Design an enzyme around this catalytic site. Structure first.
Site, mmCIF file in Angstrom:
data_model
loop_
_atom_site.group_PDB
_atom_site.id
_atom_site.type_symbol
_atom_site.label_atom_id
_atom_site.label_comp_id
_atom_site.label_asym_id
_atom_site.label_seq_id
_atom_site.Cartn_x
_atom_site.Cartn_y
_atom_site.Cartn_z
ATOM 1 N N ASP D 14 1.039 -0.977 0.199
ATOM 2 C CA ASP D 14 -0.498 -0.140 -0.027
ATOM 3 C C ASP D 14 0.647 0.989 -0.249
ATOM 4 O O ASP D 14 1.556 1.662 1.027
ATOM 5 C CB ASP D 14 -0.854 -0.284 0.721
ATOM 6 C CG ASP D 14 -2.427 0.637 1.012
ATOM 7 O OD1 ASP D 14 -1.877 2.005 0.610
ATOM 8 O OD2 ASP D 14 -3.010 0.702 2.192
ATOM 9 N N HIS D 16 -0.381 4.549 -0.257
ATOM 10 C CA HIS D 16 -1.087 5.887 0.137
ATOM 11 C C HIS D 16 -0.809 6.611 1.266
ATOM 12 O O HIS D 16 -0.306 5.780 2.394
ATOM 13 C CB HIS D 16 -2.749 5.711 0.766
ATOM 14 C CG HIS D 16 -3.911 5.312 -0.548
ATOM 15 N ND1 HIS D 16 -3.523 3.694 -0.572
ATOM 16 C CD2 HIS D 16 -4.254 5.642 -1.420
ATOM 17 C CE1 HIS D 16 -4.526 4.027 -1.801
ATOM 18 N NE2 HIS D 16 -5.160 5.578 -2.590
#
Ligand code: B12
Ligand code: B12
Ligand SMILES: C[C@H]1O[C@@H](n2cnc3c(N)ncnc32)[C@H](O)[C@@H]1O
Ligand SMILES: C[C@H]1O[C@@H](n2cnc3c(N)ncnc32)[C@H](O)[C@@H]1O
Ligand SMILES: N[C@@H](CCC(=O)O)C(=O)O
Ligand SMILES: N[C@@H](CCC(=O)O)C(=O)O
EC number: 5.4.99.1
Lengths: 137, 483, 483, 137
Positions: D14, D16
């Site tokens: 991930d 983000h």
């Protein structure tokens, strides 16, 4: 198609007019004699027109939602008028709001309408049903 | 009474009032003395006129839904939801169509039938039957200004009741609440009966009570050219001002071409102020309302949002003072409170996503405004000429001669000769001019624009194109292209 | 390999190819000779590059969603739904994040878990794991062109497989699929690996196979100044063209101010064409893609539509070749097929309500375009200077020195010095300039724009405004206004 | 209190990063020592940092949806590492798609997470829960 007569109108205190114009056009174009009594028509005006013109069917348009009230009783007045078995159609936006359509169809058929149409019904659908019903496809 | 564009005297108005108040037993609840003191106790936040002034000052577009049901408590619960969960800036109360035709007997039956059925069988709120007591309970239950929204050729009793009921705006006018909404009412009679409604606001204003009036811009909602719609609203603004109205919202229905729409709203606002000032009404506060797409909607709810939000973007960039909210239920029936809050939330998000943005001037815009102002002037000029200076008499004669002609109006006093159709960029234009008094240059420009459509679609411009245009948005697009 | 902005020779490329295909056993499925013949047999209706050409010819904006799930049949079912019920113009396949990090072991595990769970536990389609035979099954099951959409610093194997799989577009570039999507990858190495992806398209075009490439415009989707985003796209277009790419879609992420957005997209298209031609790339077909709001969405689905359709309106009026659809589930999780088709339906309805409409030129627009091109040119000029004429080396050095600097990028090679914030009309501006090489005039215009916001909100411009802007749309408006 | 320490990161594959910047800023402003290991962090990086800094809690952010896979097993590695009792928080967009939240919450608590947060959680909520849990309100 063989020519036949229908009475066309918008019932009660309803002033919607564009659908009326289009329905007149499309039914006329399909070979019917359209007796158009126009908007804001009480039951009695439909019945008078049917008798004067010996109509094969009465197409009741109701857009404004109060047709559930306004449509009650027409079959009885037609029978009293000597119009027994005349075809009675009702279409448009015939109840107030989005409702479960099978419930609405049964409500109006129980009221004496032969055919009950949901919002957004094309003219061509009623023209097919009317030809079939008058045995003139 | 004779029709003249002249303010009614106090005596004339009082005589009419004593007649009007007898038309239903609730008329006995109207006491103008008590009503002015009630109205003056309304907080500014709940006065429609005052809040519009605030909106103008802030350069914000305010969102207003439509809404109404037969029973009083249910009606209140609906508006409270639209306020609270929807985020509305103004509240309506949409009056049922039996009321609109002055059939209070049918209202009453419909009230009983709705009680019995557990749902509204009326398509609106029967304000005459609920009377001043009921209208006030509505106002007291909400925290936003209230406006009567409807379509009533003879609105005199209604107006006395909702204003005494604390509702500080009344929509309508003698043309716009006749021609799209009636078949047998003469233009003279509805102009006279709307003179009453305007005159009543005039009385209230003379007492220091501020009440908004809103001519209904979209008329039949069906391909109305901007210049015909704007002539009607300017006219109704002038006729209201003569009776003493001081706070006026002029209205326009979206046609769908953004530049045409923004040109139409700006020309409407600018020519309304120009005409008011040229005829000596120098204390009139003018605002604009933009109505989202008043034609047939697509049945699919996601497509419906496409229409609702594009329409809002145009309103926003136009600098509309107010935007009237459509819902995803539009194609089907009167929205539930949830469908309505959905439309309001989508609308307000769009407005907030566009905070302070305006369409800048361009050549395209200036050209369209010039066309619109010119067309509109042609019509107004002829009206004044027919009335020998009196715009009310001129309106009656304009309708008689087809100088003013509203597409698809059911009124038998409407000529029905003029025919609108869209051009190749979706602007609504004149296809058949009937007796609309345009110069050849103006007609030529409409023809030129339409020919571009013929060239592109491979077919001559025609009434079939008109039908295609009437259905286009419900089938998913602005312009009725072949297929 | 050493990084230079020079087309890889056939031998160089082949040598790299033999290494790349060994990175997962489905590499064995790629046969270039066979793949060329397969690709040439795809109908023009299913070729992305050829359909872009048609859209440009027709003046229409095409709609494309995002979509992908772990299992092959489910993925096809989903694309078929978006095609058939949504009305999509183009189809994606959104690649899962393990694939993007070259972890095909985790892809396999997630396929297994998804099979057991009856729902996708991957956030996308594991293309490498499904191999050429799976990607072909997907293409064969649909009736529209397919594009790999993802965010992969080392995409060489993925590109070999999807293109042999008949997918006729690949999104990405060595900056845009590094800095928003990676922490530890040098800019040198992602540019080298993206030269591969571009060179592979170059090969195919040398054989007469047309394949689109699309640099990823929005980057971190978080207040990216148009001039910084456009400098990246123009760079990625130039570096692609050097490897032989002939069909490029440059992209831009909505910032929210319509004039700023339309100015950005037009500047992007114009300067990209200008730069390509200035560097001798004279046969490149350039299209544009507008992405609907790539920052945080509101959780309320009706408000989400307000965002989707205002974004679409901007795209429409910008003359975008393509628009990427967001969904009402955006704030929450990967959309269900239903939520996705709602997004597409709402989008396409807005486009169809705006057919042929464009934002006309205005002084406001002219001014903004001039700002954006000057800003962009400052950056690009500096990059070429640092690279001593070589744009690839210039990019490495620009990142090293803060000349190119992407807001909130996780990459440790991004300076993170430049700070964006919105001005009082919602346009994204430069709050802190870092080492972005602007003139005093450019810097002072940003400061002037931002002071107008300080004055209006009664607070100094600051990082707190930035945080407010990051949250604003999710909380219901464009600009992070106080309280 | 007594400067409490947290490890903050984004798990798995991930990338983000915006939430992470804000969470860092908010918890720092609330008085915590934030040990931010950033994005694309495997479980072992949360544990190493918690060991080295003697962290009071580990805050696992997961936005990209595969957290349901990635998050499994942290509690056991923590115990095996000598971090029995450490507070484990997880939030963001922790499952793929819109799901019924009580079902999701349950699934992660079952994994050994002390607290589990839905999409759109304001950092202030986590800050208030953490001060309570660490008895430093
Ligand atoms: C234009 C419009 C208006 C215009 C009408 C101008 C005019 N005089 O014609 C204006 C703005 C004035 C208006 C007014 C009002 N409106 Co209106 N209007 C519409 C709108 C937007 C489109 C109607 C239209 O013309 N469609 C185009 C034509 C071609 O289609 P159509 O009318 O649907 O007719 C077709 C089909 O229904 C079908 N069909 C119709 N009847 C029949 C009959 C048979 C036998 C057959 C086979 C087929 C058939 O074929 C027709 C021809 O193609 C609709 C909403 C929508 N559909 O999106 C609301 C709508 C009809 N209006 C509505 C209402 C509530 C009103 C008012 C009654 C408000 C009120 N509370 O009093 C008033 C009218 C006052 C009155 N006295 O009746 C509601 C009805 C609600 C309901 N049933 O639950 C609608 C559905 C909007 C809504 N969702 O709330 N409206
Ligand atoms: C910006 C954005 C991006 C940017 C990110 C740039 C970057 N590097 O940061 C870009 C465009 C690159 C992008 C990429 C992708 N994205 Co993204 N992205 C978003 C978006 C639009 C907003 C995220 C954001 O920054 N919000 C603002 C910050 C401030 O808030 P936040 O991140 O939500 O965090 C806050 C809260 O969640 C909370 N919080 C978070 N963690 C924790 C932990 C605790 C303990 C507590 C108390 C609170 C808490 O507090 C935070 C701060 O206020 C969301 C959707 C949305 N929210 O509308 C999707 C979203 C997160 N993305 C998503 C996905 C799928 C992807 C990708 C993984 C695609 C893919 N298939 O690979 C890739 C990334 C590749 C990868 N390897 O991970 C999905 C996840 C789906 C799901 N869970 O079902 C979302 C929900 C969109 C969607 N609906 O599909 N994206
Ligand atoms: C004229 C327009 O006003 C709206 N409209 C009409 N009556 C109502 C009502 N009672 N409630 C809500 N909206 C209504 C419809 O959306 C219609 O098309
Ligand atoms: C980067 C953007 O891509 C979209 N996105 C990411 N993965 C998917 C998926 N599997 N399906 C649909 N949309 C997705 C989200 O809307 C996100 O915010
Ligand atoms: N004039 C009315 C029309 C809606 C109705 O018919 O109630 C309005 O603008 O709300
Ligand atoms: N570059 C990708 C980002 C979306 C994703 O991460 O899946 C696109 O534009 O679709």
């Amino acid at each position: 198609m063989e020519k036949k007569t229908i009475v066309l109108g918008v019932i009660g205190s309803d002033c919607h007019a564009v659908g009326n114009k289009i329905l007149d056009h499309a039914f006329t174009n399909a070979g019917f004699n359209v007796v158009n009594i126009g908007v804001l028509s009480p039951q009695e005006n439909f019945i008078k027109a049917a008798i004067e013109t010996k109509a094969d069917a009465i197409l009741v348009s109701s857009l404004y939602g109060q047709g559930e009230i306004d449509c009650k009783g027409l079959r009885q007045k037609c029978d009293e008028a000597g119009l027994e078995g005349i075809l009675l159609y009702v279409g448009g936006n015939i109840v107030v709001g989005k409702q479960h359509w099978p419930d609405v169809e049964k409500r109006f058929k129980d009221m004496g309408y032969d055919r009950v149409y949901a919002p957004g019904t094309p003219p061509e659908v009623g023209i097919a049903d009317l030809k079939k019903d008058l045995n003139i496809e | 009474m004779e029709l003249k564009n002249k303010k009614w005297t106090d005596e004339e108005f009082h005589k009419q009032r004593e007649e009007v108040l007898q038309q239903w037993p609730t008329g006995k609840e109207v006491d103008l003395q008590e009503a002015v003191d009630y109205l003056k106790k309304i907080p500014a936040e709940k006065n429609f006129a005052e809040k519009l002034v605030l909106a103008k000052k802030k350069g914000i577009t305010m969102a207003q839904p439509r809404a109404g049901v037969a029973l009083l408590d249910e009606h209140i619960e609906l508006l409270r939801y639209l306020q609270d969960e929807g985020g509305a800036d103004f509240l309506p109360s949409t009056i049922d169509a039996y009321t609109r035709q002055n059939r209070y007997d049918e209202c009453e039956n419909g009230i009983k039938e709705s009680e019995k059925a557990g749902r509204s069988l009326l398509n609106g709120f029967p304000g005459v039957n609920f009377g001043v007591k009921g209208c006030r309970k509505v106002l007291e239950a909400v925290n936003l200004p209230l406006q009567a929204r409807h379509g009533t050729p003879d609105s005199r009793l209604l107006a006395e009741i909702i204003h005494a009921g604390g509702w500080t705006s009344n929509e309508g006018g003698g043309i716009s609440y006749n021609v799209p909404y009636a078949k047998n009412v003469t233009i003279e009679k509805s102009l006279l009966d709307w003179q009453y409604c305007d005159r009543l606001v005039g009385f209230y204003e003379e007492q220091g009570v501020h009440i908004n009036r809103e001519p209904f811009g979209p008329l039949t909602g069906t391909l109305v050219p901007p210049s015909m719609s704007n002539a009607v609203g300017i006219t109704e603004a002038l006729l209201a001002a003569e009776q003493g109205v001081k706070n006026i919202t002029v209205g326009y229905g979206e046609c769908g071409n953004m530049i045409q729409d923004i040109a139409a709203l700006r020309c409407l606002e600018e020519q309304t102020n120009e005409y008011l000032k040229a005829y000596g009404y120098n204390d009139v506060f003018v605002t604009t309302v933009f109505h989202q797409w008043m034609g047939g909607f697509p049945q699919d709810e996601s497509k419906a949002f496409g229409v609702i939000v594009t329409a809002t973007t145009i309103a926003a960039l136009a600098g509309a003072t107010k935007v009237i909210v459509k819902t995803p239920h539009e194609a089907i029936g009167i929205p539930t409170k949830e469908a309505n809050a959905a439309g309001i939330k989508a609308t307000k998000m769009a407005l907030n996503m566009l905070e302070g943005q305006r369409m800048p001037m361009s050549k395209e815009l200036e050209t369209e405004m010039a066309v619109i102002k010119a067309e509109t002037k042609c019509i107004l000029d002829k009206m004044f000429e027919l009335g020998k200076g009196d715009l009310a008499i001129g309106t009656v004669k304009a309708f008689e001669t087809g100088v003013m002609d509203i597409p698809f109006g059911p009124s038998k006093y409407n000529a029905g000769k003029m025919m609108p159709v869209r051009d190749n960029l979706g602007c609504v234009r004149y296809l058949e001019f009937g007796n609309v008094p345009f110069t050849e240059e103006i007609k030529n420009y409409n023809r030129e624009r339409l020919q571009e459509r013929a060239k592109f679609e491979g077919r001559d411009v025609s009434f079939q194109m008109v039908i295609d245009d009437i259905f286009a948005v419900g089938k998913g697009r602005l312009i009725g292209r072949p297929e």
